[PDB]
Amino acid sequence: FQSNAMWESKFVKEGLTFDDVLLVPAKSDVLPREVSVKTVLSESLQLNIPLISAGMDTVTEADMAIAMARQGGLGIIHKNMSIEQQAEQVDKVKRSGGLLVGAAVGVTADAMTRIDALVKASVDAIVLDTAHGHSQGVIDKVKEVRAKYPSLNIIAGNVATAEATKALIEAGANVVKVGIGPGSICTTRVVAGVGVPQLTAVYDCATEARKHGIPVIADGGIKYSGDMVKALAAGAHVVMLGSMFAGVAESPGETEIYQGRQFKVYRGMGSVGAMEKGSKLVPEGIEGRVPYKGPLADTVHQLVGGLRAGMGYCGAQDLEFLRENAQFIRMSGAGLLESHPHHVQITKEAPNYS
Amino acid sequence: SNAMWESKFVKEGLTFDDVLLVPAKSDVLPREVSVKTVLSESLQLNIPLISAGMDTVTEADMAIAMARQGGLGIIHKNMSIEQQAEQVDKVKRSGGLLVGAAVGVTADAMTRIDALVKASVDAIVLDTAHGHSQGVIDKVKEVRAKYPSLNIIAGNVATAEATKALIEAGANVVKVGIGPGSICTTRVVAGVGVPQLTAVYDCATEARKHGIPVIADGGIKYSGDMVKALAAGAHVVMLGSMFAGVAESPGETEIYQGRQFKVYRGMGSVGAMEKGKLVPEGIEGRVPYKGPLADTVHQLVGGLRAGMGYCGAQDLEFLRENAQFIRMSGAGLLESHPHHVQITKEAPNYS
Amino acid sequence: NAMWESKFVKEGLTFDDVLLVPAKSDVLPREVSVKTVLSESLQLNIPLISAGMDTVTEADMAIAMARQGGLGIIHKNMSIEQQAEQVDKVKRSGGLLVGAAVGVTADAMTRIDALVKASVDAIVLDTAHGHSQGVIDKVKEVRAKYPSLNIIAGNVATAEATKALIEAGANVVKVGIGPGSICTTRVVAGVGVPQLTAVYDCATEARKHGIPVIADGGIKYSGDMVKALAAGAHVVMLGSMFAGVAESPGETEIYQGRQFKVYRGMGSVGAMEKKKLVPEGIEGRVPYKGPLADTVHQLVGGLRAGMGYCGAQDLEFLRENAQFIRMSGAGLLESHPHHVQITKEAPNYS
Amino acid sequence: NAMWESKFVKEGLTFDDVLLVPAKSDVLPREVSVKTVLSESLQLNIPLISAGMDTVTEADMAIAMARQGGLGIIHKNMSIEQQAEQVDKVKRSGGLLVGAAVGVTADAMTRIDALVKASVDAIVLDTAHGHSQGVIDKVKEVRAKYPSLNIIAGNVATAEATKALIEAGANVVKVGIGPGSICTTRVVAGVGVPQLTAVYDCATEARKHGIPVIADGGIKYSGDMVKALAAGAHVVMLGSMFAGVAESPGETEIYQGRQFKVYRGMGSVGAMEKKKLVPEGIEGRVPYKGPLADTVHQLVGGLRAGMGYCGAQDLEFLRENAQFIRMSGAGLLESHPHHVQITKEAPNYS
């Protein structure tokens, strides 16, 4: 009947994102240079740094995955290519000294065929990427892959609620990817009206996944290295970055001079440009440019450096302590203005602030 | 009694940019969801879109295009009674299409309604600035007593009491929206308004008891705002600025800075009132030319279908009854839009 | 330990935080009564007062304001003789109501005596901090010598300060610490109360004694005046919205083909000159708007629209029954015109 | 589970989130006392300390700050002999008070020995994270060797951190992690506390031991200083507001016809080289302001006006009695001047 308790709970929940909070410094006994940033995603997947490059056609291919793995991270080779081409990218990364590599797979009828070639190429993890992870199609596809490959690392997403996280874990997924709408090139929340603020989404999903011993991945919305520290402190084992990697030298594509500086193309996989590469349509992403940042090593050094400093401020020896003990404090828009530089004209741009 | 003095600053309101829709378990794909909606027995739409009854938005060509897309058009009342009845008759002659017409609360209101009924209009829109007026209530009772089977759309209102008053007067559809229009200054020049998402939610809460649908009119800037309006209790949304740049809109295309634009102004603006001193409650402006209506409608329905898919809603009734929101700050809004990226090209659904 | 734990308890609201809730209405906007009674000998046909500033109100402004049904406050940045002649000029042109600003100094009573001889209708004892012992002692001194004189005291922003001035003998209290468009008090001194909360807090106290309050400062559109009156104020005082009017002092200057007029705070460097100075105001310019009658028509028109939305037959009903709803910053962007390139200016929105 | 469920419970306020509520005042701004006592051997006529940065305070700045009634902290980006000569130069200029900054290294004890022999008045054991064991162990090592030396330890932003440094030997605590105008700690590390909540939380613990705190960073206008003192701080520390005066280190540059001075964070690349460093500061420029005396007069002038609004005859009354009121971003826009095109620059606003 009309006894709709859902009607009066429509506007009950509240959500927080990175710019809403700060990490509260605590007693510390460990220097930043001696903290442990290693993380374990499964029994056959350990990362020395908690950084994964996104599986997008302007972010990660073979050269990016090789450079990411040599930094201690992981690269997800995108799926906007043929099955044999993607397997050739995976095989190229594997032969380069026994490095880790991942590959993205869509939820289509041809998914099992693509996963077969990736497993034959000795892929370490597949990423069942989709816009709405909490669908029956993704759930059924996780179970079919789990039955065929019991020892394969499966990364499933994207989700933003605890119930969605529970459904993917009991379907076979050993890693859950969190993020509906936070991406720098994403318009899902604008054209569809759906999303969860990324920090609340990471906290709600990690709350459910910690009951089963499953890690979660913070995917999208990270603009500065401090946002990565907040995502890990909110419960995530590892973060996935797109915009902060699209400008590095190992990224696909060359440099074009724009506004007098070198720029690189960065576009969403749900944009018009990306969807036509693998084919009106209602897009959920945009196309654009990010500044050129030189080699990947210089960017990863700044990222890890900011994490080590933040863990020093919080007294975290390893990521598990930060995940379980770090406390936040909420601030208003005025607090954000105070957090950034203010009332001073910046002359030289810093390696970690633009 | 100091009850009214102590409750002045108690209520709180939310707009579209304050909230997001929470994803839920989904068994349906966006292309297999149903966007149909029923306002009454004699007024069913294939898509939940109504074009605003404004002189720069909807005339005969716009109403014909809206109906052939599955929606509805409201012929504006800034014309003679014979001209509005003739435009209604043109739309009906184009294949029995659904069409509406706007009527004010004046002395010639019944005369204009008499001519619109003879033209076989499908719905009368008694539109006024303050729907919670005694004159508006009396007019609805005067029309309902004369035409017991006529679809009467009354507005605009923004509170639960006003919704109950118009329903008890005879209105079978209620229009919600005081202030949120893109060309509206009512909240600025008069200080009166209710945040549109809270207004829709409060009016639908009262209207759902009596089985009366509400129209979310004004404030919609992207296709995601329409999803939030329907999820908040609205059966159908009304759009103005989203339809002004469409080729089927009345008025020719102007050239400004080489680009193509179309005039868009509020019915309470100075220019609109001089057509048919003054204290205006709207402004006059221009919007970019968007081309044929079919391209704009495709993007709007596509975002709605994607939104219903995220929420696991097969039909619009499930969205109204089950969709949950989450509140966010301004920082959440900035995260929701694209950010820290130099946009290269404009998207079809993101301007 | 109670004062230490209550430092951050209070919350405050301003005009852009709220909207008025429409209500059942049986009255058309052209039927409403905008009259207001400040005292037995001070009745206004419109709830509008022009601020006592040297770029807003002099003889010509006060004459035009009073003819529209309002009131003008002649500023005090002039000699006693010159201010007495300004007041007499307004009285000699039809017997119009007029007010005059007076500061708290040793010269205060001498200036008040000349204004009273000029048949001034209301003295505005305007100071930066109305909640001081010097201002209170001055109000008792003036009321003792002039029992029938209308005394407007300010500025204050708390219920405690409102009660102190009423018990001192003031019959009208002026509210506003910081919200002025040219004011920097909250920036340079860190002190203030959000104007809508200040009006409501002071009106809550003043209504117990049957004393009206003036909402002074922060009004940038006609809708802000409606909110201030609905929050408990009997009348509003405007500065920036009258500084561009032709009847204001100063000439019109043209900048990039558009006319402007000078507008500055009385605590700015320029006003007090007319290194050792620490100002609490800035100096700037506002667009030229032409005759006062056009601005007043838009102002009263916007008020009549708002009173119609609220079902207020008179200002006393709106003062006691109007309800607000709070909104965020996204609600403010929705309230203003948005996502449309504005082609031409409106007479009440620029 | 308790630590997991309390992650997002606390809420923090900054300067632009609140205003000071005006109260009854029997005291004029010119007759209030702005003196403060940090310890028995460190008393200041005005509550101003210039930051220990290579673009803010050296010998000339500390001399001018001391002659104005404040204190200057010699930065540590120089050899031990250079810093001792700078401290000695300030002492030779009429027995003026001077402070010196010291880092937490193995060289710290040797640097402190040379500063003590130069008759330094207070050392500033400054570091990025004052709530670490190395900073605690260093304070205890310095306190044991110099029981009468004024030790200012920081930086911190938590009551627990304040207690740890107090029990280690520090008689003055410096509050501030993030709010600096040139600081990017909160951006690149994600760590910080809104400055006004940090000052209030740390002063809450410090006052239970009779220990003063220093509000360090985030002050953009004179009103922010009044809020920091009213939040519980005995004295404020300024960097950006002092870097543009003549007495600060560096020389004047020209940019777009105006005069500027270089101002950079000590955690910036330029300050540390004086691509392996991960900086927590930026390099920039600030407009030239002239002699220090003109800036100090506007700062103290804002404090005297704010204390007059609050009815605080001394700084102790302001810390113990001043009440705040919270406001939204709309209230912040009302606080600043608005809807008026500013024509002239005020000596205390932009």
Ligand SMILES: C=C(C)c1cccc(C(C)(C)NC(=O)Nc2ccc(Cl)c(N[C@@H]3OC[C@@H](O)[C@@H](O)[C@H]3O)c2)c1
């Ligand atoms: C004012 C700032 C912020 C600043 C100034 C100059 C330079 C810095 C740099 C950029 C170097 N960043 C920094 O040192 N970050 C930091 C972060 C977290 C922690 Cl826990 C620590 N912990 C230890 O504290 C004790 C002492 O040994 C310190 O040297 C350090 O090793 C340090 C920053």
Ligand SMILES: C=C(C)c1cccc(C(C)(C)NC(=O)Nc2ccc(Cl)c(N[C@@H]3OC[C@@H](O)[C@@H](O)[C@H]3O)c2)c1
């Ligand atoms: C990263 C994003 C957002 C993105 C990337 C590339 C492309 C897209 C596009 C723009 C194509 N939009 C999208 O797919 N929208 C969407 C919306 C709502 C729902 Cl419920 C679904 N549901 C189904 O999920 C399971 C699987 O069947 C999927 O194929 C899908 O049909 C999809 C978006």
Ligand SMILES: C=C(C)c1cccc(C(C)(C)NC(=O)Nc2ccc(Cl)c(N[C@@H]3OC[C@@H](O)[C@@H](O)[C@H]3O)c2)c1
């Ligand atoms: C805001 C919109 C959409 C708008 C559109 C065109 C024009 C207007 C104008 C600018 C004319 N302003 C308006 O009419 N203001 C208004 C304010 C308050 C009240 Cl109470 C009323 N009451 C109505 O008076 C007339 C009659 O319809 C009565 O029945 C009653 O409803 C009207 C505004």
Ligand SMILES: C=C(C)c1cccc(C(C)(C)NC(=O)Nc2ccc(Cl)c(N[C@@H]3OC[C@@H](O)[C@@H](O)[C@H]3O)c2)c1
């Ligand atoms: C409208 C403003 C703000 C303004 C207008 C013109 C000039 C001013 C100036 C810039 C001069 N600042 C000012 O006076 N600041 C102020 C601050 C705090 C207090 Cl407590 C007081 N107390 C007053 O001392 C003198 C005496 O009148 C006392 O009775 C009492 O009123 C004054 C400001």
Ligand SMILES: O=c1[nH]cnc2c1ncn2[C@@H]1O[C@H](COP(=O)(O)O)[C@@H](O)[C@H]1O
């Ligand atoms: O076009 C798209 N629409 C919505 N989300 C996208 C799209 N393309 C990439 N994403 C997401 O955004 C993430 C990277 O965004 P960023 O790191 O914040 O710039 C990816 O890992 C995806 O999860």
Ligand SMILES: O=c1[nH]cnc2c1ncn2[C@@H]1O[C@H](COP(=O)(O)O)[C@@H](O)[C@H]1O
């Ligand atoms: O001038 C006016 N004043 C106030 N509201 C108006 C005016 N003109 C149109 N509207 C409203 O605004 C709606 C369209 O606004 P939009 O869809 O946001 O651009 C219309 O359907 C009316 O409800």
Ligand SMILES: O=c1[nH]cnc2c1ncn2[C@@H]1O[C@H](COP(=O)(O)O)[C@@H](O)[C@H]1O
């Ligand atoms: O310089 C000043 N400092 C602080 N407040 C002022 C100053 N000058 C005028 N005001 C106040 O600001 C009001 C007008 O401001 P406005 O109408 O909002 O622009 C006046 O009536 C005074 O109450």
Ligand SMILES: O=c1[nH]cnc2c1ncn2[C@@H]1O[C@H](COP(=O)(O)O)[C@@H](O)[C@H]1O
């Ligand atoms: O580079 C740095 N990183 C972080 N904080 C800094 C740095 N340099 C100075 N600070 C802090 O910022 C204060 C001055 O900043 P300001 O007065 O707000 O502009 C100093 O007293 C230090 O506490």
Ligand SMILES: [K+]
């Ligand atoms: K900062």
Ligand SMILES: [K+]
């Ligand atoms: K986004």
Ligand SMILES: [K+]
């Ligand atoms: K509007």
Ligand SMILES: [K+]
């Ligand atoms: K102001």
